Amino acid sequence: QDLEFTKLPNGLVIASLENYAPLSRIGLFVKAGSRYEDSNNLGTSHLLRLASSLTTKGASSFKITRGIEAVGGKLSVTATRENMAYTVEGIRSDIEILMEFLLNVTTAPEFRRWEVAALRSQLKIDKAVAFQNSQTRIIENLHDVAYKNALANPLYCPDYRMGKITSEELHYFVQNHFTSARMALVGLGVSHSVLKQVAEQFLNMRGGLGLAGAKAKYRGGEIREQNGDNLVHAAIVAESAAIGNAEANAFSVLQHLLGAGPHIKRGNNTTSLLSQSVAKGSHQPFDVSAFNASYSDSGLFGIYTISQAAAAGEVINAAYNQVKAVAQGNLSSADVQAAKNKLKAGYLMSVETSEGFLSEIGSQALAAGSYMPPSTVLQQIDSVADADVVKAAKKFVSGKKSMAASGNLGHTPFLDEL
Amino acid sequence: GPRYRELARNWIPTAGMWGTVGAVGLVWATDWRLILDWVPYING
Amino acid sequence: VAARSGPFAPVLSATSRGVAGAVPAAPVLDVAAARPLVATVGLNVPASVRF
Amino acid sequence: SVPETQVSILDNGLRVASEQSSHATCTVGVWIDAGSRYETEKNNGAGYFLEHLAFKGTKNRPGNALEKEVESIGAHLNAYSTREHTAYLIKALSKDLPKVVELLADIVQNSSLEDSQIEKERDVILREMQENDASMQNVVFDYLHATAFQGTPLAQAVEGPSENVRRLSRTDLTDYLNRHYKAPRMVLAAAGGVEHQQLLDLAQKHLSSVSRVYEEDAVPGLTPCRFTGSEIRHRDDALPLAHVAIAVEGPGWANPDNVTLQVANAIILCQSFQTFNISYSDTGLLGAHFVCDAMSIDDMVFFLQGQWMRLCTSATESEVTRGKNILRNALVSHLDGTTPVCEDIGRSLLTYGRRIPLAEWESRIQEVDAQMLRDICSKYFYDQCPAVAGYGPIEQLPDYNRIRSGMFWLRF
Amino acid sequence: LDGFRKWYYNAAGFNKLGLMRDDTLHETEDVKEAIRRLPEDLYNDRMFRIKRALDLTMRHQILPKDQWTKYEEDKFYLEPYLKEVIRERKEREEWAKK
């Protein structure tokens, strides 16, 4: 059948699709990302993300682990700067107790102090594993230098805050952001009725709208961290459109025009106006792409470069110059059509998997409360037109930039030189 | 418990064997001729 | 830095004495692209970042 | 209610299989029964270097023409090579189904190996091999394959020795291409929003005339390998962590107790500790890959060994039920996504000769109980000589007598 | 029964060393898990009370009668934390049994 939606009077969104899949998935989406913290409770969302298997009021930890592993189901937590999503999946004959476990975890945690004291070492280990690659550190640095208050908060807990996050901070964060008006329960392979009926046992406790988050403010700035990696990972971004604004799409078409990354393995070359503009001048190994991250109040669009330290300068300059050409109208309609085809194929392959489909429905729910059929999107992306793309470009080419650099930065330029 | 019982089964033959080995060894070393007088060749 | 800094001097002058609270004893883990990071952690599924 | 995988066969011999689903992002993919097992130590990197070069240049699409086309519809182009199979797959939209198939046709035949391109790749491959050593678990699994299949074509690696990589001739490659790219050893697999009749038409037009006749009847043939229990201990104490893999001989693709062995893996200290059932044809390696600090490898080995014996001697129904549930969630399906379903078909037509449906997998899972699990585990784990591969600070890793002897419980 | 329990509390004699009832529990595995889950201030008071009782037993003295632990006042602090340890312990045991 099709997707089916009810908005409950306490604000909770219920979305269901019964496709008679052998494995069914059920996720719950909360507007409780890392942007809702301030300087007093930094890293609380990271410990909340890692605290999904802790003794809940309804279920002891042993059960919340042995019962999910007994049926072979999976419980995972995915977190962005805006949204958290707790997802369970398993055989249709066990999703009743899977919803019991998931809704107990979402609605009634206990946050015992010895459990979080044991979890803080896992928090440190998870942060080290996450920052084992340079991209993660350079994107966290880029957000920290790009924004002032809201979206500048890191996804991972700072080093000083380990050992300082308490049970009361987790309880305050849950009581202020895990309310029914900020939650959508989305189920693929289940009946809508049960979701409605599992939305009453729980998700009825907190009916508020939660403690809304401050508006994110852009700051600009360039940060460089000599780390030794032969490769100077450099991200240069500027402020862009919010998710909803039409301009948004234009920026997605602009990143797929300026390269969206590789499309071929071990042979991903000349796949980008950027890649072409770098490769016509530099014979060193490189990786240049376009970065776009848009959140419900603000967006970042820019370029991302990995290169040998020595060439790091002009490669960045070459990439920047290519965007300036797009800001001068130097583009062809066939290139924009190919960018639109790449963007729509990427969207369809993102929603072709079950967990990606459940995430998409989830995001749409929290964002606009409505489901937008894949088809609808296709015609809206088509709405974006050439001039629109050019426009977004000039926004980037003019707006104050924010630069995060890492590596041997002896030949990496600055923003006033860039 | 139910599970523990299953474990027992798997070890029952094993225990029997070891017990059997014990029995055999005991008789052999002890030189007990009562039981041994009941074996075809060694008897004597 | 005698007349220029004064009180701020000791901040710009290492002074290892060479010859002639104290420091309190001041990790190895198991083992590109562009897109907003999205951290993931699972009950049993190992964590991951799909940037 | 899962749609069946329909298989047809073309005169050439290539099997143009397919599958269909509401999805609209199909993954078309050519699988070839050609890997490092079919190489004869004089062309040990031919499949890898053809994989690196196949995408870069085809006769009809000169230079980087193909990679442009693939960009024009926004499709994704991937390829991989194992010791037994090679795959070239494209993720695209449904409406771009014909041209994608035509693109795949060029990639398998009419491909052009530019001697220049050959050279550029040589650099890429050599350098990576020169940096591949960085990935320890890859080093440990290559060491395990080498010491377990000593003297056979299964010891070598997909990459091959540096020498073979340096020395490669358009002609050598041409041979591997003309020898191991036969039409009866090829499957055209499609998953997602594809029609089987349209794919069968496209198959003939673009993928017909695929070679099928070998040269001077140099029809390849294969060797049943030997599992030589042995160890390899690459000691390098400067590394922070140690990677240790211990395996025994696996049954193969066609032996059904694999399913039972998978349940045993689903039943199973030192950081990462993953169990594995590498299963090549006519042999495989059941086992474990545990990383660990130098001071705990010893204990880990014991723990691992302990677990195995427990599975040979004291398996209960509850852990068997848990392992069956864990296995039944590794079922690959449309919800797993096209590429995964795509891949299965190709591997199922290459290995089993047919696509095993998920209902048959569920039947073979539910027939597994605790008694046959401990019987099959005693058949494959108990009192067997393992292959051991260690890399890192592995001095406290026990030698071969302690490992082998630990494989038998004096109490049974 | 209440008065006879007070008389037995006086006859037990750990109140004369200033100890609580939960200080006198034998540290098994469950008791050590319950002690580890205590907050820092309660743990520090428990360790000081145990050290003072050991010092008084060393000198073969007791506290003055105004400093003894009144039966009514004794607080069973470890008890709440202990029950949980036992509950969790049993749950785990049952799971294995089954």
Side-chain angles (χ1 to χ4, degrees), chain D residues 236-304:
Chain D
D236 192 6
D237 269 332
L239 299 159
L241 287 171
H243 298 227
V244 173
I246 300 165
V248 293
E249 190 168 0
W253 279 113
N255 196 358
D257 48 15
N258 275 287
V259 178
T260 308
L261 289 177
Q262 282 167 3
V263 180
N265 286 338
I267 295 178
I268 308 151
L269 180 45
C270 276
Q271 279 58 22
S272 170
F273 158 52
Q274 47 176 357
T275 54
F276 64 76
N277 180 6
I278 303 185
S279 307
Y280 297 112
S281 182
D282 289 345
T283 189
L285 310 187
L286 189 45
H289 172 255
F290 55 86
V291 178
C292 186
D293 51 347
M295 303 304 300
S296 307
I297 299 184
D298 187 2
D299 306 344
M300 190 72 180
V301 168
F302 171 82
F303 158 83
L304 168 59

Coordinates of all heavy atoms in Angstrom, one line a residue, chain D residues 236-304:
Chain D
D236 N 56.7 -7.7 14.2 CA 57.1 -6.3 14.1 C 56.6 -5.6 15.3 O 55.4 -5.3 15.4 CB 56.6 -5.7 12.8 CG 57.2 -4.4 12.5 OD1 58.2 -4.0 13.2 OD2 56.8 -3.7 11.5
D237 N 57.5 -5.4 16.3 CA 57.1 -4.9 17.6 C 56.8 -3.5 17.7 O 56.4 -3.0 18.7 CB 58.2 -5.3 18.6 CG 58.1 -6.6 19.3 OD1 56.9 -7.1 19.4 OD2 59.1 -7.2 19.7
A238 N 57.1 -2.7 16.6 CA 56.8 -1.3 16.6 C 55.3 -1.0 16.4 O 54.9 0.2 16.7 CB 57.6 -0.6 15.5
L239 N 54.5 -1.9 15.9 CA 53.1 -1.7 15.7 C 52.3 -1.7 17.1 O 52.7 -2.4 18.0 CB 52.5 -2.8 14.9 CG 53.1 -2.8 13.5 CD1 52.9 -4.2 12.8 CD2 52.5 -1.7 12.6
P240 N 51.3 -0.8 17.2 CA 50.6 -0.7 18.5 C 49.7 -1.9 18.9 O 49.5 -2.2 20.0 CB 49.8 0.6 18.4 CG 49.6 0.7 16.9 CD 50.8 0.2 16.3
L241 N 49.1 -2.5 17.8 CA 48.2 -3.6 18.0 C 48.5 -4.8 17.2 O 49.2 -4.7 16.2 CB 46.7 -3.1 17.7 CG 46.1 -2.2 18.7 CD1 44.8 -1.6 18.2 CD2 45.9 -2.9 20.0
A242 N 48.1 -6.0 17.6 CA 48.4 -7.2 17.0 C 47.1 -7.8 16.4 O 46.0 -7.8 17.1 CB 49.0 -8.2 18.0
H243 N 47.2 -8.3 15.2 CA 46.1 -9.0 14.5 C 46.4 -10.5 14.3 O 47.4 -10.8 13.8 CB 45.8 -8.3 13.2 CG 45.4 -6.9 13.2 ND1 44.3 -6.4 12.5 CD2 45.9 -5.8 13.8 CE1 44.2 -5.1 12.7 NE2 45.2 -4.7 13.5
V244 N 45.5 -11.3 14.8 CA 45.7 -12.8 14.8 C 44.5 -13.4 14.2 O 43.3 -13.2 14.6 CB 46.0 -13.4 16.1 CG1 46.0 -14.9 16.1 CG2 47.3 -12.8 16.7
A245 N 44.7 -14.3 13.1 CA 43.6 -15.0 12.5 C 43.9 -16.5 12.6 O 45.0 -17.0 12.3 CB 43.4 -14.7 11.1
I246 N 42.9 -17.3 13.1 CA 43.0 -18.7 13.2 C 41.8 -19.4 12.5 O 40.7 -19.0 12.7 CB 43.0 -19.2 14.7 CG1 44.2 -18.6 15.5 CG2 43.0 -20.7 14.8 CD1 44.0 -18.7 17.0
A247 N 42.1 -20.3 11.6 CA 41.1 -20.9 10.7 C 41.3 -22.4 10.6 O 42.4 -22.9 10.8 CB 41.0 -20.2 9.4
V248 N 40.2 -23.1 10.2 CA 40.3 -24.5 9.8 C 39.7 -24.6 8.4 O 39.2 -23.6 7.9 CB 39.6 -25.4 10.8 CG1 40.3 -25.4 12.1 CG2 38.2 -25.0 11.0
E249 N 39.8 -25.8 7.8 CA 39.3 -26.0 6.5 C 37.7 -25.9 6.5 O 37.1 -26.6 7.3 CB 39.7 -27.3 5.9 CG 39.5 -27.5 4.4 CD 40.2 -28.6 3.8 OE1 40.9 -29.3 4.6 OE2 40.0 -28.9 2.6
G250 N 37.2 -25.1 5.5 CA 35.8 -25.0 5.3 C 35.3 -26.1 4.3 O 36.1 -26.7 3.6
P251 N 34.0 -26.2 4.3 CA 33.4 -27.3 3.4 C 33.3 -26.9 1.9 O 33.5 -27.8 1.1 CB 32.0 -27.5 4.0 CG 31.7 -26.2 4.7 CD 32.9 -25.6 5.1
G252 N 33.0 -25.7 1.6 CA 32.8 -25.3 0.3 C 31.5 -24.6 0.1 O 30.7 -24.5 1.0
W253 N 31.2 -24.3 -1.2 CA 30.0 -23.6 -1.5 C 28.8 -24.5 -1.5 O 27.7 -24.2 -0.9 CB 30.1 -22.9 -2.9 CG 30.8 -21.6 -2.9 CD1 32.0 -21.3 -3.5 CD2 30.3 -20.4 -2.3 NE1 32.3 -20.0 -3.3 CE2 31.3 -19.4 -2.5 CE3 29.2 -20.0 -1.5 CZ2 31.2 -18.1 -2.1 CZ3 29.1 -18.7 -1.1 CH2 30.0 -17.8 -1.4
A254 N 28.9 -25.7 -2.1 CA 27.8 -26.6 -2.3 C 27.4 -27.5 -1.1 O 26.4 -28.2 -1.2 CB 28.1 -27.5 -3.5
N255 N 28.2 -27.5 -0.1 CA 27.9 -28.3 1.1 C 27.0 -27.6 2.0 O 27.3 -26.5 2.5 CB 29.2 -28.7 1.8 CG 29.1 -29.9 2.7 OD1 28.1 -30.5 2.9 ND2 30.2 -30.3 3.3
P256 N 25.8 -28.2 2.3 CA 24.7 -27.5 3.0 C 25.1 -27.2 4.5 O 24.5 -26.2 5.0 CB 23.5 -28.4 2.9 CG 23.8 -29.2 1.7 CD 25.2 -29.4 1.7
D257 N 26.0 -27.9 5.1 CA 26.3 -27.7 6.5 C 27.0 -26.4 6.8 O 27.1 -26.0 8.0 CB 27.1 -28.9 7.1 CG 28.3 -29.2 6.2 OD1 28.7 -28.4 5.3 OD2 28.9 -30.3 6.4
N258 N 27.4 -25.7 5.8 CA 27.8 -24.3 5.8 C 26.7 -23.5 6.6 O 27.1 -22.7 7.4 CB 27.8 -23.7 4.4 CG 29.2 -23.9 3.7 OD1 30.1 -23.3 4.1 ND2 29.2 -24.9 2.8
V259 N 25.4 -23.7 6.3 CA 24.3 -23.0 7.0 C 24.5 -23.3 8.5 O 24.5 -22.3 9.3 CB 23.0 -23.6 6.5 CG1 21.8 -22.9 7.2 CG2 22.9 -23.3 5.0
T260 N 24.7 -24.5 8.9 CA 24.9 -24.9 10.3 C 26.1 -24.2 10.8 O 26.1 -23.6 11.9 CB 25.0 -26.4 10.4 OG1 23.9 -27.0 9.8 CG2 25.0 -26.8 11.9
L261 N 27.2 -24.2 10.0 CA 28.4 -23.5 10.5 C 28.2 -22.0 10.6 O 28.7 -21.4 11.6 CB 29.5 -23.7 9.5 CG 30.1 -25.2 9.5 CD1 31.1 -25.3 8.4 CD2 30.6 -25.5 10.9
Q262 N 27.3 -21.4 9.8 CA 27.0 -20.0 9.9 C 26.2 -19.8 11.3 O 26.6 -18.8 12.0 CB 26.1 -19.6 8.8 CG 26.9 -19.3 7.5 CD 26.0 -19.2 6.3 OE1 24.8 -19.2 6.4 NE2 26.6 -19.0 5.1
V263 N 25.4 -20.7 11.7 CA 24.7 -20.6 12.9 C 25.7 -20.6 14.1 O 25.6 -19.9 15.0 CB 23.6 -21.7 13.1 CG1 22.9 -21.6 14.4 CG2 22.6 -21.6 12.0
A264 N 26.8 -21.5 13.9 CA 27.8 -21.6 14.9 C 28.6 -20.2 15.0 O 28.8 -19.8 16.1 CB 28.8 -22.7 14.5
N265 N 28.8 -19.6 13.9 CA 29.4 -18.3 13.9 C 28.5 -17.3 14.6 O 29.0 -16.4 15.3 CB 29.8 -17.8 12.5 CG 31.0 -18.6 11.9 OD1 31.8 -19.1 12.6 ND2 31.1 -18.6 10.6
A266 N 27.2 -17.4 14.4 CA 26.2 -16.5 15.0 C 26.2 -16.7 16.5 O 25.8 -15.8 17.3 CB 24.9 -16.7 14.4
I267 N 26.6 -17.9 17.0 CA 26.8 -18.1 18.4 C 28.0 -17.3 19.0 O 27.9 -16.7 20.0 CB 26.8 -19.6 18.8 CG1 25.5 -20.3 18.4 CG2 27.1 -19.8 20.3 CD1 25.5 -21.7 18.7
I268 N 29.1 -17.3 18.2 CA 30.3 -16.6 18.7 C 30.2 -15.1 18.4 O 30.5 -14.3 19.2 CB 31.5 -17.2 18.1 CG1 31.5 -18.8 18.3 CG2 32.8 -16.6 18.7 CD1 32.2 -19.6 17.3
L269 N 36.7 -9.5 24.3 CA 38.0 -9.7 25.1 C 39.1 -8.9 24.4 O 39.5 -7.8 24.9 CB 38.4 -11.1 25.2 CG 39.7 -11.4 25.9 CD1 39.7 -10.6 27.2 CD2 39.8 -12.9 26.2
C270 N 39.6 -9.4 23.3 CA 40.7 -8.7 22.7 C 40.1 -7.8 21.6 O 39.9 -8.2 20.5 CB 41.7 -9.7 22.1 SG 42.9 -10.2 23.4
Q271 N 39.7 -6.6 22.0 CA 39.2 -5.6 21.0 C 38.3 -6.3 20.0 O 37.4 -7.0 20.4 CB 40.3 -4.9 20.3 CG 41.0 -3.8 21.1 CD 41.5 -4.2 22.4 OE1 41.8 -5.4 22.6 NE2 41.7 -3.3 23.3
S272 N 38.5 -6.1 18.7 CA 37.7 -6.8 17.7 C 37.9 -8.3 17.7 O 39.0 -8.7 17.9 CB 38.0 -6.2 16.3 OG 37.4 -7.0 15.3
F273 N 36.8 -9.0 17.5 CA 37.0 -10.5 17.5 C 35.8 -11.0 16.6 O 34.8 -11.3 17.1 CB 36.8 -11.1 18.9 CG 36.4 -12.5 18.9 CD1 37.1 -13.4 18.1 CD2 35.3 -12.9 19.6 CE1 36.7 -14.7 18.1 CE2 35.0 -14.2 19.6 CZ 35.7 -15.2 18.9
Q274 N 36.1 -11.0 15.3 CA 35.0 -11.4 14.5 C 35.2 -12.8 14.0 O 36.3 -13.2 13.8 CB 35.0 -10.5 13.3 CG 36.4 -10.3 12.7 CD 36.4 -9.5 11.4 OE1 35.3 -9.0 10.9 NE2 37.5 -9.2 10.9
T275 N 34.1 -13.5 13.9 CA 34.2 -14.9 13.3 C 34.0 -14.8 11.8 O 33.4 -13.9 11.4 CB 33.2 -15.8 14.0 OG1 31.9 -15.3 13.8 CG2 33.5 -16.0 15.4
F276 N 34.5 -15.8 11.1 CA 34.4 -15.7 9.7 C 34.3 -17.1 9.0 O 34.8 -18.1 9.5 CB 35.6 -15.0 9.0 CG 36.9 -15.7 9.3 CD1 37.3 -16.8 8.5 CD2 37.8 -15.1 10.2 CE1 38.5 -17.4 8.7 CE2 39.0 -15.7 10.4 CZ 39.4 -16.9 9.7
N277 N 33.6 -17.2 7.9 CA 33.5 -18.5 7.2 C 33.9 -18.2 5.7 O 33.0 -18.2 4.9 CB 32.1 -19.0 7.3 CG 32.0 -20.4 6.6 OD1 33.0 -20.9 6.1 ND2 30.8 -20.9 6.5
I278 N 35.1 -17.9 5.5 CA 35.5 -17.8 4.1 C 35.3 -19.1 3.5 O 35.9 -20.2 3.9 CB 37.0 -17.3 4.0 CG1 37.2 -16.0 4.7 CG2 37.3 -17.1 2.5 CD1 38.6 -15.5 4.6
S279 N 34.5 -19.1 2.4 CA 34.2 -20.3 1.7 C 34.4 -20.3 0.2 O 33.5 -19.9 -0.6 CB 32.7 -20.7 2.0 OG 32.5 -20.7 3.3
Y280 N 35.6 -20.7 -0.3 CA 35.9 -20.7 -1.7 C 35.3 -22.0 -2.2 O 34.6 -22.7 -1.5 CB 37.4 -20.7 -1.9 CG 38.0 -19.5 -1.4 CD1 38.9 -19.5 -0.4 CD2 37.8 -18.3 -2.1 CE1 39.5 -18.3 0.1 CE2 38.4 -17.1 -1.6 CZ 39.2 -17.1 -0.6 OH 39.8 -16.0 -0.1
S281 N 35.5 -22.3 -3.5 CA 35.0 -23.6 -4.0 C 35.8 -24.8 -3.6 O 37.0 -24.7 -3.6 CB 34.8 -23.5 -5.5 OG 34.3 -24.7 -6.0
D282 N 35.1 -25.8 -3.2 CA 35.8 -27.0 -2.7 C 36.7 -26.9 -1.5 O 37.4 -27.8 -1.1 CB 36.7 -27.7 -3.9 CG 35.8 -28.3 -5.0 OD1 34.6 -28.6 -4.8 OD2 36.4 -28.6 -6.0
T283 N 36.6 -25.7 -0.9 CA 37.4 -25.5 0.4 C 37.1 -24.1 0.9 O 36.6 -23.2 0.2 CB 38.9 -25.6 0.3 OG1 39.4 -25.6 1.7 CG2 39.5 -24.5 -0.5
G284 N 37.3 -23.9 2.2 CA 37.1 -22.6 2.8 C 37.8 -22.5 4.1 O 38.6 -23.4 4.4
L285 N 37.7 -21.4 4.8 CA 38.4 -21.3 6.1 C 37.4 -20.8 7.1 O 36.9 -19.7 7.0 CB 39.5 -20.3 6.0 CG 40.6 -20.4 4.9 CD1 41.7 -19.4 5.2 CD2 41.2 -21.8 4.9
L286 N 37.0 -21.7 8.0 CA 36.1 -21.2 9.1 C 37.1 -20.7 10.1 O 38.2 -21.2 10.1 CB 35.4 -22.4 9.7 CG 34.3 -22.2 10.7 CD1 33.4 -21.0 10.2 CD2 33.4 -23.4 10.8
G287 N 36.7 -19.8 11.0 CA 37.7 -19.2 11.9 C 37.5 -18.0 12.8 O 36.4 -17.9 13.3
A288 N 38.5 -17.1 12.9 CA 38.3 -15.9 13.7 C 39.4 -14.9 13.5 O 40.6 -15.3 13.2 CB 38.3 -16.3 15.2
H289 N 39.1 -13.6 13.6 CA 40.2 -12.6 13.4 C 40.2 -11.6 14.6 O 39.6 -10.6 14.5 CB 39.9 -11.7 12.2 CG 40.8 -10.5 12.0 ND1 40.4 -9.2 12.3 CD2 42.1 -10.4 11.7 CE1 41.4 -8.4 12.2 NE2 42.4 -9.1 11.7
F290 N 41.0 -12.0 15.6 CA 41.0 -11.1 16.8 C 42.2 -10.2 16.9 O 43.3 -10.7 16.9 CB 40.9 -12.0 18.0 CG 41.9 -13.1 18.1 CD1 43.2 -12.8 18.7 CD2 41.7 -14.4 17.7 CE1 44.1 -13.8 18.8 CE2 42.6 -15.4 17.9 CZ 43.8 -15.1 18.4
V291 N 41.9 -8.9 17.1 CA 43.0 -8.0 17.3 C 43.2 -7.9 18.8 O 42.2 -8.3 19.5 CB 42.7 -6.6 16.8 CG1 43.8 -5.6 17.1 CG2 42.4 -6.7 15.3
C292 N 44.3 -7.5 19.3 CA 44.5 -7.5 20.7 C 45.9 -7.0 21.1 O 46.9 -7.1 20.3 CB 44.4 -9.0 21.2 SG 44.5 -9.1 22.9
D293 N 46.0 -6.4 22.2 CA 47.3 -5.9 22.7 C 48.2 -7.1 22.9 O 47.7 -8.2 23.2 CB 47.2 -5.1 24.0 CG 46.4 -5.9 25.1 OD1 45.7 -6.9 24.7 OD2 46.4 -5.4 26.2
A294 N 49.5 -6.9 22.9 CA 50.4 -8.0 22.9 C 50.2 -8.9 24.2 O 50.6 -10.0 24.2 CB 51.8 -7.5 22.9
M295 N 49.7 -8.3 25.2 CA 49.6 -9.1 26.5 C 48.4 -9.9 26.7 O 48.2 -10.6 27.7 CB 49.8 -8.2 27.7 CG 51.1 -7.4 27.6 SD 52.6 -8.4 27.5 CE 52.4 -9.4 29.0
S296 N 47.5 -9.9 25.7 CA 46.2 -10.6 25.9 C 45.9 -11.5 24.7 O 44.9 -12.2 24.8 CB 45.1 -9.6 26.0 OG 45.3 -8.6 27.0
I297 N 46.8 -11.6 23.7 CA 46.6 -12.5 22.6 C 46.5 -13.9 23.2 O 45.6 -14.7 22.8 CB 47.7 -12.4 21.6 CG1 47.8 -11.0 21.0 CG2 47.5 -13.4 20.5 CD1 48.9 -11.0 20.0
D298 N 47.3 -14.2 24.1 CA 47.4 -15.5 24.7 C 46.0 -15.9 25.2 O 45.5 -16.9 24.9 CB 48.4 -15.6 25.8 CG 48.6 -17.0 26.3 OD1 48.0 -17.9 25.8 OD2 49.4 -17.2 27.3
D299 N 45.5 -15.0 26.1 CA 44.2 -15.4 26.7 C 43.2 -15.5 25.7 O 42.3 -16.4 25.7 CB 43.8 -14.3 27.7 CG 44.9 -14.0 28.7 OD1 45.8 -14.8 28.9 OD2 44.8 -12.9 29.4
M300 N 43.2 -14.6 24.7 CA 42.2 -14.5 23.7 C 42.2 -15.9 23.0 O 41.1 -16.5 22.9 CB 42.4 -13.4 22.7 CG 41.2 -13.2 21.8 SD 39.9 -12.4 22.7 CE 38.7 -12.2 21.3
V301 N 43.4 -16.3 22.6 CA 43.4 -17.6 21.9 C 42.7 -18.6 22.7 O 41.8 -19.3 22.2 CB 44.8 -18.0 21.6 CG1 44.8 -19.5 21.1 CG2 45.5 -17.1 20.7
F302 N 43.0 -18.7 24.0 CA 42.3 -19.6 24.8 C 40.8 -19.5 24.8 O 40.1 -20.4 24.7 CB 42.8 -19.6 26.2 CG 42.1 -20.4 27.2 CD1 42.3 -21.8 27.3 CD2 41.1 -19.9 28.0 CE1 41.6 -22.6 28.2 CE2 40.4 -20.6 28.9 CZ 40.6 -22.0 29.0
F303 N 40.4 -18.2 24.9 CA 38.9 -18.0 25.0 C 38.3 -18.4 23.7 O 37.3 -19.1 23.7 CB 38.6 -16.5 25.2 CG 37.3 -16.1 24.7 CD1 36.2 -16.3 25.5 CD2 37.1 -15.5 23.4 CE1 34.9 -15.9 25.1 CE2 35.9 -15.1 23.0 CZ 34.8 -15.3 23.8
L304 N 38.9 -18.1 22.6 CA 38.4 -18.5 21.3 C 38.3 -20.0 21.3 O 37.3 -20.5 21.0 CB 39.3 -18.0 20.2 CG 39.0 -18.6 18.8 CD1 37.6 -18.3 18.4 CD2 40.0 -18.1 17.8

